[PDB]
């Protein structure tokens, strides 16, 4: 199993975003330019809206890997602020130490 149902749904969102990465990249090119006439751009808006909801990368939420905490998570280690401390204080992460200056 996964840690949480929210994590379960986020994995599906990431998978479908990767599956539709190319299509959205191609459709957004027709919308983000001024050279082409607006008549085709209004239809481009329609087909980019016709895509499934979870396909956009905006719905992707960066949670923690271990505890799936939706907030307080560092991007470098993909770890929550609590699990990161729990590991660093035990010394299982290299180069990480208490700051004294």
């Amino acid at each position: 199993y996964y840690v949480d149902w929210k994590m379960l749904r986020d994995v599906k969102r990431r998978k479908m975003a990767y599956e539709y990465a190319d299509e959205r990249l191609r459709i957004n090119s027709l919308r983000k330019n001024t050279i082409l006439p607006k008549d085709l751009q209004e239809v481009a808006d329609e087909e980019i809206a016709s895509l499934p909801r979870d396909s956009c990368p905006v719905r992707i939420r960066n949670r923690c890997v271990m505890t799936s905490r939706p907030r307080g998570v560092k991007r470098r280690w993909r770890l929550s602020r609590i699990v990161f401390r729990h590991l660093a204080d035990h010394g299982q992460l290299s180069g990480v130490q208490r700051a004294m200056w």
């Binding site: 191609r26 090119s29 330019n33 050279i35 082409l36 006439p37 008549d39 085709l40 239809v43």
Partner: protein, 77 residues
């Protein structure tokens, strides 16, 4: 090591003008495809075949949607 990129060279990545021959030369389609080609040519994250498919996608999309280009008022093929 272990990544040859199908034995491609710099001319297969930088110069994609050879794939723009079946497009209107003097229309806004060239204005848009030249920016697309410039973007793809500065892309080290993709192989040559993926850029070929990227060009072919615009190819078939433009050749499929023919009524809109004729209705827009500009003569496009």
């Amino acid at each position: 090591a272990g990544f040859d990129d199908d034995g491609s060279e710099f001319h297969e990545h930088i110069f994609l003008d050879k794939y723009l021959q079946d497009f209107p030369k003097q229309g806004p389609i060239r204005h848009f495809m030249e920016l697309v080609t410039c973007g793809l040519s500065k892309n080290p994250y993709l192989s040559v075949k993926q850029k070929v498919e990227h060009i072919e996608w615009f190819r078939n999309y433009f050749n499929e949607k023919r009524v809109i280009l004729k209705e827009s008022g500009i003569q496009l093929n």
